[PDB]
C-alpha cells in the first residue's frame, strides 16, 4: 500500500522541519498531523480519515508493538533518527505521538546555550567544586537536560567516575554510565542513589528529586565529598531553597551542602533574515523592565516572517538563565528563616540577574522579541 | 434470550413515547414497568415475574454495575445506539426485588458560553485568569449534577487552540469536542485515571484534563503533572474550597505539594431560579435576612418568590442559576497550608482576603432577584 | 572457561598495581576496566564484550550473590587466595552491569601517626586530645581523605586490657582483636543513635561513632563527652573551624560546643612525588607568594614535578600523603564561641594562634619535596 | 552442662571480687571476660571460644531476652540467689559475636524519705496534695534510671496505711514493702499489666500501682480504674508533662478520658550534683545565663563547678539531684484537651499558670549551688 510512503513522509518532513514532536490525532470528523516547532504546535497535514487505522498500525510495526489491541495505551521506541513512540486510545481512533531525540544536534557547548558571560562563569565555577550540589530548575522542556548534559559533557575524563540515574535516559554517552530506572520493580531515585555511594563515584547525576527520601540521600551525597547534579520543578530559582525546607530538609544542610541553583526557561529566537525594529513605548518597557538608564539604547525587533521562518517570524530558541550560586549572605538568610521575597531581594541586590532581567537583556541584544519576554518569563515584583 | 430484545423494546418504546422517566420496580404480587409522560406516570408493562431477576440483572450489566452486591444501591449511566442515546440508571434494593430507574439525559441545548454561566464578575476574573498559566492545577468541586463538567468545558472551550495539545480523560465524555483529545475509560479493560495520566505525560501535553481524582494513585501523578510545567483540570465532590484542601491532605498528599501545585479551587452548586413571569416580591424580616448579609444593605433587599403558571408546572421556579465560590491560591493561603492548617482557619483567611463564599454569592443573586431565600437556604450552609 | 583466569587477572593485577578501586563498566560500544590509583582513575583494560555477561556473572558467584536478577543492584564481600578480601557493588547500567570492587587491605593498615604526614607539632596536639579522660576529638574531611585511617590508628594507639572501647561503624572496614566492633545495619532498626544508646549502657571508657549526621546523634554524643568518656567521631565540613559552626547550626548550644570538645582536626590527601624520577620545577616567586606563601623564604623554595618513569607507570606520582590542620581549643577560641563569633572570626583567631591551615600544612610538605606544587594547589583551598 | 556452672562461676567470682562491672565480649581472635574493680578494668578469663555462643545465649535466657533476634541490642535484668542478688544486663550485637555486659544494682541505701528527694517546695505541695484523692491517676515520666520508681515509692510509703488496700504490679519489684501487695509479672506465663489490672478491680483495691503503661490494652483499663473511684500510679518514658498527654492521645485514648482521669503528670530527670568540697565559683556571662532565666535576677547567679578530688575520682561532681516538673491538671488545662490541644500550647498554658518547668527547676538548683550550668544544659531542653 502507499501508506508506507506516507508514514515515512511524516517522519521525514518532521526532521526537515526541525520539529521536536510529531502528533497524529484522529478525530470524529477530522484527521490531522501536527508538528511542534520551537515549542509551539502547527498543523502540517490532513491525511485522509479512511487510512487512520493503516497509518497508525504501521508505526506500531516499526516500534515492534502489538497492533491487535486498540483499547489501551502502548509505548516504545523507533530507530531509523530515533523516536520515542506513545500511543493513546482516543474515542475516534488511536493518537500517536513521536518525540524525536536528536543525537547530532545536541549542543554540548555552554557558550552556545545563550548563557550570559557572568552567569556562565558562576555555573562553570560551581560545577568544578568537588563536594557540592548543582540544581537545574524549570518546567518540562525548559532545557534542563540539555544544560545538564553539557555540564556532564564539560567534565568527563578518564580520571573520574561519573554515574547517572535518569528517568528516562535521553541520550547515550560513551564514558558515562547511565542507569534507567522504572519504579514498578522497585528502582527509585533514592535506591539508585544509595547504590551509587557504594560504587566510589566522583560525579553523580539524578534527574529530579520529588521525595524527601531521595532529597536526604542526595544532600548527604553532597556532604560526603561528591558533586551531585539534579533538578527541581519550581516557580523561580529562590523558591527551590524554601521548597527544600518544606521537603523537611534542615536549613543548615540546604545552606551548607548545595553550591548552586539555576532557573531557566526557553523563548523563541527572532529570525535573522526578517527582523525589523518595532517601536515599543519606553514606558511599557520600564513598567516591567529596567528603569530608563537603558531606555534610549533599546532597539526591539520582530520578524515579519519569510520562507526561512515558515512565516512564523521566529527561527530557533534561546535560553533565559538565572544562575544563583550560594552566597555567604544567602546561607545566612536560609539559616535565619528568611522568606522567598527577601531571598530574591538580596540576590538581585548582590548582582545576580533574574529571568525576566536576563531575558530583557537578550531583547536589547536583538536575540528575542518583547512579546516572547512577556509570554515566557513571569513578572517580577 | 428473548428478554434481551424485550429489555431493549421497553427503552425503544419509551423513546417513541414522550416519557422522560422509566421504572421497572419489582413486587411480589405483580410487576410494574412504568413510564412518566409530561410528569404524569403510567403503568405500561406487566412482564414475566420469572424473568424479573433475569431482566433486572441484565440492565445492571449494561451500566457497568457490579451484580455481586444486590443488597446496596448502585448508580451509573449507559449509552444506546441511535441515529446517539444516553441514560442514567439508579438501582435500589427492594425487599422483594431490585428496582431500576432510568432517567433520560439530554446532552444538547447546553452550550459553552462562559459569560452566561453566571460566574460573578470578580469570580470570573479569578477563574479565567487562573485557567491560563503554564504552571498550575485547577479543581472544580460540587455534588453530581452541579454542572461541574459544563463549567470545565467552558474553560476548555476558551483554552482550546490550534497551538496547544489539550487532552481529556473522562468516564463518560459528556460532550464531544472537535480538536480536543478525548479518552473514555472503562476500568474492566484497565483504562484508568492513573493509567491515562501516565499515558498523557509521554505525549507532550500542554493541558491535561481528568474528570475527578478519587484516590491517591491518580492524585499523585496528577499533581506531578501540574509541577511538570502543565495545566491540570479536575473535579472533586466536597463541601467547599477549603474542604477540598483537607481531603487532599487526608489522601496523603504532602502539605507543600498541595500549596505548590493547585492554583485554584472553585466550588459551585446549581439552584432553581425563580420564574420570570411568576416572581412577586415577598417581604421577609430584614433581621433574619440580615442574619444570613450586611446589616447596612439589609433594608434594600427585596427577594422574589414565584407562585406558579403553565410554564413552570406550578413549581414556582424556572431555570438553574449556580452559586459560585472561587478561591485562587494566595500567598497568604499558601503560607497557611505550610505552617499547618485547619479547614475553618482556611475559610476565615480566604473570606477576609476578599474571596466571596457560596452564601454571599447566593445572596447577591437574591438581591438581584434571580433566586429566593428558600432556595439559598436549601443549597448553602451558613458561613456565620 | 578463560573467564575464571581473566577475572582473577583483573583482581591480581589490581593488587600488584596498588589500586584503591576496581571498576568493570560495560558500554554500548566499548568495554572497559578501570583502576583507581592514588585517588586518580586510570583505565588498565579493554576486555571483549562477548565475555561481558560472563565476566559480571562469575563475580556474582564469587560474592555469593544472586545471578537471577540482572535488573537490580547487588552488594557483598569476597575473600580469595593467591589472601585478599574486598567488597563488591553491582549496578544495572543500561548496556550491562557495572561492578565496582573497593579494596580493603587486611595487613596494610598504617597504624603509625608520624607515617601519615602529621606535622610534628600537630601530632603532639592530636595525641594530647586522644589521651585525655573526657571529651571529644573530631577529625573532618571528605570521603577518601583518610579519616578512617586516622581513627583506626588512634584506637590502635591507645588500646589496653584495662579499658572497654566501643565503636559504631557503617561499615566496619577492619576487624581488630581487643576492640569490640559492631557493624551497623539501619534497615533492621539499628541507627547511630540506637547503637550509641546501647554504648552508654555497656559502661565504656572510650566510644567511637563513625559520623554524626544529625542532632539526635549529636546530642547523645555530646552528653557522653560530658559524662567522662572520650568520644571519637567525624563531621563533613570544609575545614576545622567550620566544624564548630556546623555543630551550632545543628542546634547544639554554644556552651556545650566549647566545654565538651577537646580538639578538632581536618585533613585531606594529595598525591606523592616519585622516589626516582622527581625533579625540580620552576614556580615564579610572585605567583607562589600571592597564594602559596607569605613573602619570606619564598625564594628558597624547591618545587618538584615528576617526569614519570617505569616505577610510576609514567604518572609522575607514587602514593599520597595527608595535609592536616589539628586545632585544640585555647581559651581565646572558647571565649569567642561563648560570645557568638562567626566562622571568619574563629578562623582569624585559630590562624592567629599556633594552628596551621591546610594550605600551610601542604606548603611545608612542598618544601620537603614530598608533594608537588600542582597537588598543593589542586586539593586544599586558599585561605585568603 | 559444665558451661552453666562456669557461667555462674564468673558471676560468683565477680561477687568475691570488688568489681562493679563484668564484660563477656566476644572476639574472633580471642575471648575477653573482664571485671572492673575500683573503676579500673582487668581481663579475668580466656574461656572456650567453642562455648562462646553457647554461654552468651545462656545468659540471655536468664534475662528473659529473646534469643530469636541476635542482630539487635537487648536490655534487661536478672536476680541471683544469695544469703538476694540482682544484675542489669546489656546485650549488643558484635560483628564476631554478641557482647553481654552485667552491671551490679545496689537496691539498698536508697530510702523513701520524701523531704530529701529534692522536690521544690511548691512542687512537693502539688505532688503530695495530688497523691491523696479518692479519684484520680498520677503519672511520673522520665528516662530509665531517673529515679521514677524511688519517687513513686516515696508517695507510696506516705500513702501506705493499715486502713486501705494498696497493691502494686511491677516487673521486677525494685524494693520489698511490708503490707503492700506486690505482684511481679513475667509475660511468659501470661502475667501482664492488663491482666494484673483486671485482677485488681475484683479485689476491692483502694490504691492501684502499676509500673508503666506501654500500650492501649493496659491504658484503657488503667484509666477505667481511675474513674472507678480508685487511685492510679504509673510511669511513662516521655519528654515532658505535656508530651505525656500527646502520647496518651496517640495511644487512642479519648480526649475527655485523659482530662477526666489523670489529675497529675510529673516529669523528672537525675543530674550529677557538684562536689561539696571541690565546688568553686565559676563566672559565666550573665547574658548567656540570662538567655536560659529572669534578666532581673541574672546578676545574682553564681554557679559552682567542681574540679576533682579523691572522693569524686576527679569527676567534678558527687551525688544526684533531680530536676522536677510537676503538672497538676488545672481546669484551664482541662478545657484545652477537650477543645483540642497541641503539645506546645499545653506547655504554654501550664507555664503561664505558674507551673514551673524542668529548666527553671534546674536553674533554681543552679542558683542555690547544687548543680552547674554544664549539667543543666545536658539534661534539660531549652524552654525558650
Ligand atoms: N540554548 C538553547 N539553544 C537552542 N536550543 C535549545 C537551547 N536550550 C534548549 N533548547 C532546545 O529545547 C529542548 C529542551 O528540552 P529538554 O532540555 O530535553 O527538556 P527538559 O530539560 O525538561 O528535559 C531541546 O530539544 C533543545 O533542542
Ligand atoms: N596518610 C595516608 N597515607 C597513605 N594512605 C592514606 C593516608 N590517608 C588515607 N590513605 C588511603 O585512604 C584510604 C582510606 O580512606 P578512609 O580513611 O576510608 O577515608 P574516609 O575516612 O573519608 O572514609 C586507604 O586505602 C589509604 O590507602
Ligand atoms: Mg528531562
Ligand atoms: Mg569512613
Ligand atoms: Zn523570516
Ligand atoms: Zn411560574
Ligand atoms: Zn616516576
Ligand atoms: Zn571533688
* Atom 7 of ligand 2, nearest CA residue: C146
Q: Is the CB of A113 under 6 A from ligand 1?
A: yes
Residue B275 DSSP one-character state = P
Length of chain A: 381
Q: C-contacting residues of A 327-366, CB under 8 Å?
A: 335
Helix or strand holding residue D182 (H, E): strand D181-183
- Are C98 and A198 in contact (CB < 8 Å)? no
Count other Cβ atoms within 10 Å, centred on residue A351.
Answer: 8
- Are D75 and C198 in contact (CB < 8 Å)? yes
The candidate with the shortest Cα–Cα distance to D193, out of D166, D172, D213, D173, is: D213
Q: Is the CB of C283 under 6 A from ligand 2?
A: no
Between CA C117 and CA C366 the distance in angstroms is 12
End-to-end CA separation in angstroms for chain A: 60
Ligand closest to Cα of D314 equals: 8
Tally C-beta pairs within 8 A across C and D. 89
Length of chain C: 384
- Are A200 and C100 in contact (CB < 8 Å)? yes
Scan for cell 550550668, then name that residue: D373
> Three cell numbers at A359?
531575558
Do C144 and C259 lie in a common domain? yes
Q: Is D1 on the interface with C (CB under 8 A)?
A: no
Q: Domain range holding D241?
A: 108-384
Mutate to test the pocket of ligand 1, among A139, A266, A314, A321 (most ligand atoms within 8 A of CB): A266
Q: Is C62 on the interface with D (CB under 8 A)?
A: no
Output the CA A133–ligand 1 centroid distance in Å. Answer: 22
Between CA B278 and CA B316 the distance in angstroms is 7
Scan for cell 576496581, then name that residue: C22
Do D95 and D162 lie in a common domain? no
Chains near B with 3+ CB pairs less than 8 A apart are A
The CA distance from C172 to the nearest CA of chain A, in Å, is 14
- To one decimal, the resolution in angstroms is 3.4
Phi and psi at A42, nearest 5°, equal -135, 140
Output the CA C150–ligand 2 centroid distance in Å. Answer: 8
Interface test with A, best of B162, B169, B199, B254 (most A CBs within 10 A): B199
Q: Is C303 annotated as a binding residue?
A: no
Contact present, C327 and C263 (Cβ < 8 Å): yes
Of C162, C177, C201, the CB nearest to D27: C177
Based on its alpha-carbon atoms, the radius of gyration of chain A, rounded to whole angstroms, reads: 23
Q: Is C223 on the interface with A (CB under 8 A)?
A: no
Do B225 and B103 lie in a common domain? no
Q: Is the CB of A144 under 6 A from ligand 1?
A: yes
**CATH number, domain with residue A289:** 3.40.50.300
Say whether the A–D interface has 3 or more Cβ pairs within 8 Å: no
Mutate to test the pocket of ligand 2, among C101, C149, C150, C211 (most ligand atoms within 8 A of CB): C149
Q: Is B303 annotated as a binding residue?
A: no
> Residues of D with CB below 8 A from C337's CB?
none
Do A123 and A157 lie in a common domain? yes
Output the CA A276–ligand 6 centroid distance in Å. Answer: 64
Q: Is C279 on the interface with D (CB under 8 A)?
A: no
Q: Is A235 on the interface with C (CB under 8 A)?
A: no
Q: Is A217 on the interface with C (CB under 8 A)?
A: no
| DSSP-derived pairing of the beta strands C135-140 and C165-169 | unpaired
Per the structure, the count of domains in chain A is 2
Contact present, C327 and C82 (Cβ < 8 Å): no
Do D132 and D93 lie in a common domain? no
Between CA D101 and CA D65 the distance in angstroms is 13
Do B47 and B62 lie in a common domain? yes
Q: Which of B85, B107, B129 is the last residue of a domain?
A: B107
Q: Is the CB of A214 under 6 A from ligand 1?
A: no
Beta bridge partners of A146: none
Between CA A190 and CA A182 the distance in angstroms is 12
Contact present, C116 and C149 (Cβ < 8 Å): yes
Do A330 and A194 lie in a common domain? yes
Q: A-contacting residues of C 26-45, CB under 8 Å?
A: 27-30, 34, 36, 40-43
> Residues of A with CB below 8 A from B181's CB?
25, 88, 90, 95
* Atom 1 of ligand 2, nearest CA residue: C116
Preceding omega of B172 cis (within 30 degrees of 0): yes
Do B55 and B139 lie in a common domain? no
Between CA B320 and CA D35 the distance in angstroms is 89
Q: Is D237 on the interface with C (CB under 8 A)?
A: no
Q: Is the CB of C147 under 6 A from ligand 2?
A: yes
**Residues in chain A that come right before a backbone break, where C and next N are over 2.5 Å apart:** 80
Do D36 and D86 lie in a common domain? yes
Between CA A241 and CA A330 the distance in angstroms is 10
Q: Is C143 on the interface with A (CB under 8 A)?
A: yes
Output the CA A317–ligand 5 centroid distance in Å. Answer: 14
Between CA A59 and CA A97 the distance in angstroms is 10
Based on its alpha-carbon atoms, the radius of gyration of chain C, rounded to whole angstroms, reads: 23
Length of chain D: 384
Q: Is the CB of C149 under 6 A from ligand 2?
A: yes
Output the CA A200–ligand 7 centroid distance in Å. Answer: 26
Of A28, A43, A73, the CB nearest to B176: A28
Q: Using DSSP, how many helices (H) and how many strands (E) does chain B show?
A: 13, 15
Ligand closest to Cα of A309 equals: 5
The CA distance from B169 to the nearest CA of chain A, in Å, is 9
The candidate with the shortest Cα–Cα distance to B50, out of B88, B97, B89, B9, is: B97
Do A315 and A252 lie in a common domain? yes
> Three cell numbers at C289?
607568594
Q: Is D192 on the interface with C (CB under 8 A)?
A: no
- Are A75 and B202 in contact (CB < 8 Å)? yes
Q: Which of B107, B124, B153 is the last residue of a domain?
A: B107
* Atom 25 of ligand 1, nearest CA residue: A20
Do A83 and A118 lie in a common domain? no
Do C133 and C96 lie in a common domain? no
Q: Is B117 annotated as a binding residue?
A: yes
Q: Is the CB of C10 under 6 A from ligand 2?
A: no
Phi and psi at C209, nearest 5°, equal -125, 130
> Three cell numbers at A51?
487510512
Q: Which of A35, A67, A100 is the last residue of a domain?
A: A100
Q: Is the CB of C329 under 6 A from ligand 2?
A: no
Between CA C65 and CA C76 the distance in angstroms is 7
Output the CA C145–ligand 2 centroid distance in Å. Answer: 6
> Residues of C with CB below 8 A from A196's CB?
91
- Are C41 and A160 in contact (CB < 8 Å)? yes
Q: What is the 3-state secondary structure (H, E, C) of chain C?
A: CHHHHHHHHHHHHHHHCCCCEEEEEECCCCEEEEEEECCEEEEEECCCHHHHHHHHHHHHHHCCCCCCCCCCCEEEEEEECCCEEEEEEEEEECCEEEEEEEEECCCCCCCCCHHHCCCHHHHHHHHHHHCCCCEEEEEECCCCCCHHHHHHHHHHHCCCCCCCEEEEECCCCCCCCCCEEEECCCCCCCCHHHHHHHHHHCCCCEEEECCCCCHHHHHHHHHHHHCCCEEEECCCCCCHHHHHHHHHHCCCCHHHHHHCEEEEEEEEEEEEECCCCEEEECCCHHHHHHHHCCCCCHHHCCEEEECCCCCCCCCCEEEEEEEEEEEECCHHHHHHHHCCCCHHHHHHHHHHCCCCCHHHHHHHHHHCCCECHHHHHHHCCCCC
The CA distance from A235 to the nearest CA of chain B, in Å, is 8
Of C29, C93, C246, the CB nearest to A174: C29
SS3 of residue B252 by DSSP: coil
SS3 of residue D233 by DSSP: strand
**CATH number, domain with residue D46:** 3.30.450.90
* Atom 14 of ligand 2, nearest CA residue: C146
Amino acid at each position: 500500500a502507499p501508506v508506507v510512503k506516507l508514514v515515512n513522509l511524516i517522519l521525514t518532513d518532521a526532521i526537515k522541519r526541525k520539529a521536536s514532536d510529531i502528533h497524529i490525532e484522529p478525530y470524529e470528523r477530522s484527521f490531522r498531523v501536527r508538528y511542534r516547532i520551537d515549542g509551539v504546535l502547527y498543523e502540517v497535514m490532513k491525511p485522509p480519515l479512511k487510512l487512520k487505522n493503516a497509518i497508525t498500525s504501521r508505526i506500531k510495526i516499526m516500534a515492534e508493538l502489538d497492533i491487535a489491541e486498540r483499547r489501551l495505551p502502548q509505548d516504545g521506541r523507533i530507530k531509523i533518527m530515533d523516536y520515542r513512540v506513545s500511543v493513546l486510545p482516543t474515542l475516534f481512533g488511536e493518537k500517536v505521538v513521536l518525540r524525536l531525540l536528536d543525537k547530532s544536534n545536541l549542543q554540548l557547548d555552554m557558550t552556545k546555550l545563550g548563557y550570559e558571560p557572568d552567569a556562565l562563569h558562576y555555573f562553570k565555577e560551581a560545577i568544578h567544586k568537588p563536594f557540592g550540589m548543582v540544581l537545574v530548575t524549570g518546567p518540562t522542556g525548559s532545557g534542563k537536560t540539555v544544560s545538564l548534559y553539557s555540564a556532564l559533557g564539560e567534565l568527563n575524563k578518564t580520571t573520574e567516575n561519573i554515574s547517572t540515574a535518569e528517568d528516562p535516559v535521553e541520550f547515550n554517552f560513551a564514558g558515562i554510565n547511565q542507569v534507567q530506572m522504572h519504579e514498578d520493580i522497585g528502582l527509585n531515585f533514592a535506591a539508585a542513589l544509595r547504590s551509587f555511594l557504594r560504587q566510589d563515584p566522583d560525579i553523580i547525576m539524578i534527574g529530579e528529586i520529588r521525595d524527601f527520601e531521595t532529597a536526604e540521600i542526595a544532600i548527604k551525597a553532597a556532604l560526603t565529598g561528591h558533586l551531585v547534579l539534579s533538578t527541581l520543578h519550581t516557580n523561580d530559582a529562590p523558591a527551590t531553597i524554601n521548597r527544600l525546607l518544606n521537603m523537611g530538609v534542615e536549613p543548615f544542610l540546604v545552606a551548607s551542602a548545595v553550591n548552586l541553583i539555576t532557573a531557566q526557561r526557553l523563548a523563541r529566537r527572532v529570525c535573522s533574515e526578517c527582523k525589523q525594529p518595532e517601536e515599543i513605548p519606553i514606558q511599557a518597557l520600564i513598567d516591567a523592565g529596567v528603569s530608563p538608564d537603558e531606555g534610549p539604547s533599546y532597539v526591539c525587533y520582530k520578524g515579519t516572517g519569510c520562507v526561512k521562518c515558515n512565516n512564523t517570524g521566529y527561527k530557533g530558541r534561546v535560553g533565559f538563565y538565572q544562575v544563583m550560586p550560594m552566597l555567604e549572605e544567602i546561607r545566612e538568610l536560609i539559616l535565619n528563616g528568611a522568606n522567598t521575597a527577601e531571598i530574591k531581594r538580596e540576590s538581585m541586590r548582590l548582582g545576580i540577574k533574574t529571568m525576566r532581567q536576563s531575558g530583557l537583556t537578550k531583547l536589547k541584544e536583538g536575540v528575542t522579541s518583547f512579546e516572547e519576554v512577556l509570554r515566557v518569563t513571569v513578572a517580577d515584583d
